Amino acid sequence: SDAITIRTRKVISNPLLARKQFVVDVLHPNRANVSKDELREKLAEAYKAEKDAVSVFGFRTQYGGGKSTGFGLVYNSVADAKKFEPAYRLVRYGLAEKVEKASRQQRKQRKNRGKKIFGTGKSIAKKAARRNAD
C-alpha cells in the first residue's frame, strides 16, 4: 500500500572515519515497523551505497506510528566498516560471525586457577603423576 519515504536529517560528511553520520527519518503509514534490513537494502540509491557499509542504529518508533527516527552510518568501504564498527553491530548486520568465548564466570574461574598456580602445566602434571603413584 505504502512504499515508505526515507529522508535523512542532520547529515555530517565525517572524514575522520570516512563514514557518513546522519539521522535516519522513516515514514511508514499503515506499515508495522521499518524492518531495518529493508531500510539497509533501500540505502543504495541514496548515497551510492552497498549492503555491507550501510549501518543503522537506534530506530525507536515514534508514538502514534508512521514516523520513526534512527541513526545511520554509511562507510566508504566494507574494509572501512570492518575496522571502525563495533563487532556486535557487524554480527547483527550479518558480516562478521558471532564471536564465541565462554560464560564470563567460567573465564573468571579459569583466570583464578591460573593465578593459584605457577608454570606452564607440564611440571604440575608430573607432580600429579608422582602423587598418583605415591
Binding site: 555530517i12 565525517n14 575522520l16 572515519l17 553520520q21 541513526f71 571502525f84 563495533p86
Partner: peptide, 18 residues
Amino acid sequence: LKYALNGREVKAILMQRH
C-alpha cells in the same frame, strides 16, 4: 563536534593519527 558517538569511536579517531 559530534564527530564521534562513543569512546571506542574516539579512540579509533585518535590512534589512526589524523
